[PDB]
UniProtKB/Swiss-Prot annotation:
Full-length numbering of the shown residues: 25 to 244 of 281
Record-stated family: Belongs to the class-A beta-lactamase family.
Catalysed transformations (reactions): a beta-lactam + H2O = a substituted beta-amino acid
Protein name as it appears in the record: Beta-lactamase
Species annotation: Staphylococcus aureus
Positions bound to substrate: 240-242
Amino acid sequence: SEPIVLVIFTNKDNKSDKPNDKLISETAKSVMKEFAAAAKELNDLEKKYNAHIGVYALDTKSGKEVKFNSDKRFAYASTSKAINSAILLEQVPYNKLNKKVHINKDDIVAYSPILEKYVGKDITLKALIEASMTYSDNTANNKIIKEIGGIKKVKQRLKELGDKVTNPVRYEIELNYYSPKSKKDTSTPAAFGKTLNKLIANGKLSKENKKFLLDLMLNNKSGDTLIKDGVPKDYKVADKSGQAITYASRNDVAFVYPK
């Protein structure tokens, strides 16, 4: 069971529009229909929800790809939490994840339901990753980026994986201030999806780290209305969702195991 990598980014034309998660659900249902040997058009779904859909899906076994506006730019929001987690896990073995880092008042950013209790305390790298992936803790993600070496280093690792599209510029929460006239903190579905395959599904993580990460993603409840909602029952979905502040920017990325 090699997974299918699925990236769905959506947005709407107005700053203050609100997303409908059912759009991603329905998107996921249709695209998955493409991987068997019948399905609504993605166009019709854009019409039905009055929204823009960007999709990239790769069956890592066969190589087959499904693309729809696969090269348009979208704000990725908290879906980058997965990328940042993974990058740190390329560099720290499972058994050294009990290493502790000091958290102080200056590290704290908005929406840190886990980390706000550790001000002035030490937390392990594992709990950081848990916080970031399961609770979408913004302080945890920022500390993770710092542990990797800064935005600086993330950007250089993406270049090494051959992603010259994903453009990280700000930390949480400012990365969520998406503007369609700026490339800041955007990627395209194809770039991001290819990066997720090369970092996680088919990357250099150890089996323990890979497992640890994917377990977080499988057990995350924040994506139940999204791709998880759309694929049949029988499929395991490990996801990381996101939503930016503007233009109803609502996204989900996942590894889909049809078995």
